[PDB]
Structure formats: C-alpha cells, structure tokens
C-alpha cells in the first residue's frame with residue numbers, strides 16, 4: 001500500500017548500536033517517526049522525510065528489540081508502519 | 089495559507105521564506121526584522137532589545153507576542169502569512185493557541201550547529217529589506233549588490249562566531265522544545281508538521297519544500 005515503507009532491515013551494527021534502512025513509501029513523506037524498545041518504555045525520534053536510513057544507539061547486547069518506522073503524511077502517526085525484530 | 093518556520097538560528101529559514109512568499113503571495117513576518125526596526129527607531133526599549141540581541145539572547149515573550157499580533161492584524165496578512173523565527177518559546181506558542189491563531193504547516197529545518205557556524209562566515213545582507221545572500225552557496229548576481237535594487241550588501245556585526253554560538257545555546261535551551269510541542273499538535277490534527285534536511289544546497293532544500301507544500 002502506498003503509505004507504508006517496505007524492506008526494513010538492519011544494515012550495519014556494533015554490539016550497542018545499529019543502522020536501519022528501508023525503501024520509502026510511494027507517498028510524499030513529511031517526516032519519519034522511529035520507535036524502538038525491548039521485544040520497558042519505548043523510545044522515539046524523527047528523521048527528515050527525504051531520508052531512508054536511521055541510527056539507533058544505547059542498545060543492550062544480546063537483547064531482542066522491536067524497531068518500528070512510520071512515514072508521516074503530516075499528522076503524526078497517520079499511516080501504518082513497518083517493524084522488524086532484531087537481537088543485538 | 090499560514091506557515092511557521094522552525095529551526096536553529098542560521099539554518100536557512102529566511103532564505104527559504106523568500107521562495108514561499110514569492111509563490112503563495114503571503115508576507116514574511118520575521119520577528120528579528122521587526123526587532124531590528126525597533127532598534128533603528130531609537131526608543132529606550134529598542135536600546136534594551138539591541139543590548140539583548142548583541143548578547144545572543146531572546147527578547148521577552150510578551151513584547152514579541154504583542155508585535156506579532158499587531159503585524160498579523162494588518163491588511164496584507166488577510167490571505168495568510170509566513171512566521172519566520174516566531175514562535176520561539178513555549179509561552180509564545182501557547183499565546184498563539186490561546187488567541188486562536190491556527191496554522192497550516194510547521195516546517196522544521198534540520199541543520200547541525202557546526203555547519204551553521206561555518207555558513208554564517210559568508211553571509212551578506214541587504215540591510216533595508218533584510219534579504220540574505222551567501223558569497224559561495226547563494227551569491228548575488230553581481231558581487232556585493234542586492235539583486236532587485238542594485239544597492240550594496242553588508243555584513244552584520246552581530247555575526248561574530250561568538251554571538252552565533254550564544255544564539256545556538258539559547259536555541260537549544262528555549263526554542264527546540266517547540267519541536268515536541270508542534271509534533272503533538274500535528275498528531276492531534278491541528279496542523280501538518282514536516283522535517284527537511286537543511287544541509288543540502290539551497291536549490292535542493294527548496295525542491296524538498298516544494299514537494300511537501302501545496
């Protein structure tokens with residue numbers, strides 16, 4: 001569907017940090033909202049709508065995390081996201 | 089059409105304001121320009137504001153709110169307007185919400201502090217209008233002269249690296265909380281929010297904003 005990113009993957013990692021990448025959705029993205037937490041409070045940050053990568057740090061090694069990417073059409077979490085699970 | 093530009097001082101808001109003005113037919117409302125006019129007036133409060141600006145600090149909330157409310161009540165602001173550098177604190181944003189001043193877009197410029205300090209080195213201005221150039225990244229058509237009047241360009245004396253960094257410290261303490269403020273408004277449906285990568289060249293930031301807007 002046109003507003004949901006695809007092919008979210010971890011593309012580089014250290015024991016405590018990683019870089020995620022995705023294929024942008026078809027719509028014009030106003031900004032992205034990225035959330036992550038142990039698969040504990042969920043952390044959230046943003047990147048510009050022109051990006052398709054993001055860095056996450058402060059992770060505990062050997063722990064399973066759920067990482068979620070929303071493409072916003074301008075009204076916060078207004079489109080459905082894509083998520084991935086990853087053990088550091 | 090009503091738009092707020094948000095971002096660190098020197099991220100490029102005034103530069104992009106000109107294109108938005110030229111294409112939607114709305115006036116730019118720069119609280120910095122309004123305060124510079126107050127300084128050039130020569131009142132005691134203008135003097136007080138100049139001393140605060142020279143130290144890289146923010147002028148009091150209630151003063152700037154009053155100046156903006158007067159400015160947006162004028163006839164040229166009927167069809168809408170572009171706020172550039174206002175609001176600048178949470179109390180300034182709350183004053184707008186309490187007065188019923190809604191906006192259509194809040195546009196956040198993402199630029200790192202050390203790149204800003206680098207860029208201001210080459211800034212040049214046409215003082216009477218406040219128009220802004222850069223000797224490398226956005227040069228005037230013929231060197232040192234404003235493009236549509238031909239008068240000379242100048243450099244602000246408040247652009248010492250030292251004052252630039254003091255404005256940036258003020259920004260992260262006082263103004264950056266507005267990102268979370270308007271992100272919450274956008275999630276409530278009260279405006280649209282967008283975040284643009286302002287590290288690109290001038291023409292590409294413009295192209296990204298054209299994609300967002302309409």
Ligand SMILES: Nc1ncnc2c1ncn2[C@@H]1O[C@H](COP(=O)(O)OP(=O)(O)OP(=O)(O)OP(=O)(O)OP(=O)(O)OC[C@H]2O[C@@H](n3cnc4c(N)ncnc43)[C@H](O)[C@@H]2O)[C@@H](O)[C@H]1O
Nearest residue numbers: 097098099100101102103120147173176211221222225290
């Ligand atoms: N609401 C408020 N409440 C309380 N106090 C208030 C207030 N509002 C104002 N004040 C007071 O007034 C003072 C001044 O306020 P204000 O006049 O708003 O100045 P400022 O805060 O220092 O912000 P700037 O005008 O320097 O930056 P800009 O983002 O517009 O970037 P620009 O387009 O010029 O670009 C910068 C340079 O980089 C160049 N450039 C632009 N874009 C690019 C690009 N994409 N790539 C390379 N170079 C670029 C430009 O050509 C230029 O040379 C404040 O410090 C405060 O004391």
Ligand SMILES: [Mg+2]
Nearest residue numbers: 101102103120
């Ligand atoms: Mg400006």
